[model samples]
Target: SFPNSFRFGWSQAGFQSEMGTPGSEDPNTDWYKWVHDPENMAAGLVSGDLPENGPGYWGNYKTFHDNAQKMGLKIARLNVEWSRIFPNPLPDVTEVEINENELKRLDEYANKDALNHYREIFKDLKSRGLYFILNMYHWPLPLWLHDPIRVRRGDFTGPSGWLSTRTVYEFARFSAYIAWKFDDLVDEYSTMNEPNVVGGLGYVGVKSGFPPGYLSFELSRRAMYNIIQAHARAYDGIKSVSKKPVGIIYANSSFQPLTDKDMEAVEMAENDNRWWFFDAIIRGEITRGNEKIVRDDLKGRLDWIGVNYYTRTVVKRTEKGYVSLGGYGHGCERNSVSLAGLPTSDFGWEFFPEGLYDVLTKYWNRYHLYMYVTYNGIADDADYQRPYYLVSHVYQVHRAINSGADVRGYLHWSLADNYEWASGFSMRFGLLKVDYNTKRLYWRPSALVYREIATNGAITDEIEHLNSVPPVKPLRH
Candidate 1:
């Protein structure tokens, strides 16, 4: 009796909460040279960090979407920053710049001016009735699609022909022209949010400096089959131009097996880290044989499955060998080998909130599909323990919806505090508290305890007024 349409949303992403907004009217990106890199941000942290007059969700998008709709968050997961809408490619090329048909007509006029400024900011948040959920790709990579030794060619096949199938058909025609121009204000259409942490932890192991490494697992299976064929060709161009419901946000993790001769290396990290893209978008194939570009009949081509539960993956058998522990928590080398003794996150991670009920009852007992926990919180220091880590992970998402786990909607990853990438803003995953040197928004206490779990879905009396503003000391494990 619990499926009354499991909804509740709140996840933002456009270049990490769309700030420093410049090139869209046709500027071109690589995050405008990663915000004019003076060694890429945070010393005085200019661009837009927080409350220095605002940046994370600029001018605090109506006080973080009207306090996440007074905390019952009626769906708002918006992330579409493919180099901020085809930000690179198309500045009048063809001086023999491998003119593949004039870089496919200037990558379709720079993805129609970044899908018309992302269809006027998702049709002004779907004319304010809310419910949009769109994440085309959010890791920052259009510095004119850097080659990095032609994406470790052996016949380069991923990172879109080493950056350019006209930049994956101009990001699938700006995600099928914003799913056919905000097809009745989009309900769901996640193309890519975590293709293995946007290519095994942000581009071939942390922002493509590339070497003999492209975060190998064989270039993370060719960047997860060109990011699942750029999300099944933008979920068949948003189910043939909009009727909405095209899925994929994937970032699940829950391994275990540290011994028993490493049980086939924990079933090869659970079929290549949690059912290789949900068995290639729900039983469509690609059952992980170290993938080599698959599309096994895009099985009923998903309509919902955004799961992004964080932390938990352990498997050790070291005689000074068998390794896989995560990094990039400042000490680069993309962290792995999670789930050991639990309790982490001052950027250590592994603070498994019941591994979000073991990743939504193991993907609803293996792809019964229709799930959404978009991106669970944690990345501390936002003014002390971030409201008991956002009410202990929203009560472990209400104990994975009181044990039944079809767990729809629950997003909480920044509403303020921009630039948290590459440990840039020095980790402080928002709950609204930005002073990243004057962007200003300060509401923290985990933004009034996630606006009282998005407005009293529980956590009553405003969680004793955010535990009467005091607690925060827990991290030492």
Candidate 2:
């Protein structure tokens, strides 16, 4: 459905925003420590320091904001690092007054002066008539909150309790403080970014990447539950403090069962990964089958649904019974759909534009809330493929929008190439390609496509170029 006042935008995360002043009093994050481990990072690519030739956005954000405005973007979704805002040791409470521990931590953040820089950046963007969409949490929790063992043991709560209830209260209060301070500057806010992925990567019992082989299903469920509660609390904190619209961004794909037997698997996986949090906020209950895990007070708390869709999933039957899974790995094809003849990215994800259409329609029918394609795009080093990827996805977005889905906007995954987390720089998803060796950044053809769509308000004949690019075909049923 075309709303009379729909807006379009792009997205960027804190981890991939830029590197600067790592040791500058900001609380350390797990990713910072992960990069330090010699084995955690890939060979030849040392971690710790920013790329020798950084984008310089930290020092020169004007360039990025101006460029985004020139591209006709109405909003820019970026993140604020929680750890940077409240670094130092956890606070000690039991007193009405802020004590030494709290003072020390406050000094660390004040000395680092990170919030001052963010305020400056946000001021510049707002001055240019651009709306700021703030995401509170991305991936890494604050350094002081790292508790892999406790997380493994099913302690589901986030850094809030880890640092003590006082610490959690302070963090929430700090978030409310920022909201109050910037209420006039920002138009939209997301309480947490991709809690499902956060649970899968940080709490789930599996050996995918960082934290290695310590993921457990029970812990994952607990982490997800805690994250949902945190989001609810954070959303209320920001809304009550700022009186601004707020929501949560969820990472999920449209899942389909490969066979009748696999339908149960699809439902189970969807409940655990996608619907659990959504139900918490939208339905007011942590629904599992006919049960509710949380109170109904949370319903109607969400103002919008921030959807991050990368690709569709195909669930299949297995002797292990059935399972719904994703990822481009060796054993992935055994139970999930394979890329087949489709052109695979460096990360092995298949290029599936139609999947975007499928996902948007599914959610639109189910929730009917205003939705935004918060994160959609691929990682491809080959410059030419980037343009093709944009056109393909944009066309799918246009299809979704034209079909009466309350799809308000589409935010490309990134504005510039930066850190890729765990994967490092192995996969580059930016429309602007950065030369790691020279530190020089150049616009790929996709950048031009984005510019065109942003300005013209619709895809033109140029999008057809995606069809000209060769890709693998799916194996027919």
Candidate 3:
């Protein structure tokens, strides 16, 4: 049985532009720049054709709220994009210099329309008796903070981009500003969503899917270091304005040794891929291989910890180096192994529910801080695996809680299948099936399973039965 205090909810990002474009007439977001650039589109860095509209969340959030209320979901996690809130187009200036009076001048540049829209949505959520966890950053930086040219030139050490000290300070100010603006409605504030992902894949890694796609481990570490400092400052900033719980969200996956002989390699993969970010934030330093990054002020800054688990990586040290057998093996030659027997989703992510249990218990044993399963879901178009996926993962949560982990909540990856970054609409992770064209939502089999567990406040045998059957097909009108 799950703890009565355990909350069940869903998570979504503001970057789902297909839901509905924000009210801004001219948005200067990094995504906007990336999608619009002919060079990027030609290079196949982004989708050639963008979806006409999102599920209309920006304009039709009440539809979402009504669905959540019906499902008996008590908590909802939403990300606030810094680029959307402050769309300053100036490439050279950081937001930290803007004074109260100058902020008024900058207000013209800010997306007041979107700000007002979010204010209404947040207020409505509060009146509906829903608690919200507001995430400050969700991978989209303002265009000025993420100049593609500067990034392509490998000039992260210069005055602009995510590596700049100015960017770190301004990010904290941005968090504080948001907290102060939405103080009454927010119950919790996550300083940043998946900083490691932002550093590893988006800024520095060889992955071409995200913005400013460059492949350099040196630059990746540099960006990661700056992000650690940014989170510390953002934590202080949020705390200065609101008494709400503030934390950093990390993307963690269970790393398993392929064989007994590969234990050392698995340990190395765990440290480099997962523990490096946590150690830096929680213990004030992280030593990757021989290089070390330290920030004493960041230690003990987190009030809570958010863990986003998806799948596990089975790793083995080959003649060349360490190889990972899972979805995240792109770019690294060592990670190009096979996934012959493991069950996988449409996105090729291996299904390992036990990994969720392992991650929760591991983090709790190490940090002892209140933890929330921020994002966990699979991309399944047919809804074949998602029903089982939901039940099995939540059961792991129950097991972890029984083992004395301070796991407070479990929020599925998305509220609805919105725009999935560079993958576009090809990937679907929502409990509610979304028609990208009509913006209408249909109930999936997983929704019923979730509703039963949430409304009953227990994962009964009925919920467990869902693990054996395929999801119900959507009925046509």
TM-scores, all candidates, are: 0.30, 0.83, 0.88
Runs with alpha carbons beyond 4 Å of true place in candidate 3: 17-26, 89-111, 153-160, 203-207, 286-294, 318-321, 326-340, 468-477
Clashes of each: 20, 9, 5
What C-alpha lDDT does candidate 2 achieve relative to the native structure?
Answer: 0.65
User: For residue 432, what is the lDDT in candidate 3?
Assistant: 93
lDDT, candidate 2, at 102: 44
Best by lDDT: 3
TM-score of 3: 0.88
Clashing pairs for predicted structure model 3, backbone only:
18-53, 18-54, 19-54, 19-55, 19-56
Residue 447's lDDT in candidate 3? 92
Each candidate: RMSD: 21.1, 5.3, 4.7
lDDT per residue (tens digit) for residues 1-477 in model 2: 224456667888776655532333232775565556555444432344433234456665787777778778887888887767665554411112333364445455552477788888889988887767888877766666674434434464644332234434554555565676567778888877886776676545344554422456665565555555566566666766577778778887766676676887777667656666677678787556776665755667788888887766776767765565554322233212354444555655655677788778877887888788899877776664567777777777778878888878889877777777656665688877766555456777778778887777766675766743344343221
> 1-477 in candidate 1: lDDT tens per residue?
124555556677765556642331222344434444453344332333321112545334555666556555667787766655455455411111222354355446555655665666666666666777877676556656643334433435533332344555555655765565566766678877776665664345644322213345655566556666666666766666577677877777666555668766656667756776677666666644656444554656677787776656666556644555553122222222223433456666655555567777777777667678888776665455567656666666667777666677777676566556434465667776666455556677667666556555566654645433123244342
Q: Which 10 consecutive residues of model 1 have the lowest summed lDDT? A: 91-100
| Greater-lDDT candidate between 1 and 2 | 2
Candidate 2's clash total is 9
List residue ranges in candidate 2 displaced over 4 A. 1-4, 20-27, 38-54, 90-112, 147-171, 211-213, 259-265, 287-290, 318-321, 325-339, 467-469, 472-477
**Model 1 alpha-carbon drift over 4 Å, by segment:** 1-181, 184-188, 191-234, 237-239, 242-247, 254-263, 267-269, 276-279, 282-296, 299-307, 315-374, 378-384, 387-411, 414-442, 445-477
Q: Model 3, range 1-477, lDDT digits (tens) per residue?
A: 677778899888877732464542234566666666687777777776454356777777888889988998988888777876787654311123324564355455667777887898888887777778998987777777777645665666533557677778778778877887788888888988888887777755444567677777776677777887788878777776678888878888787887899988887887778776777668877665787766567677788889899877778898877987644422122212224334556665766778889889988887798899999998887777788889888888889989999999999987788777776777888999988667788889889888998888788875667543232233110
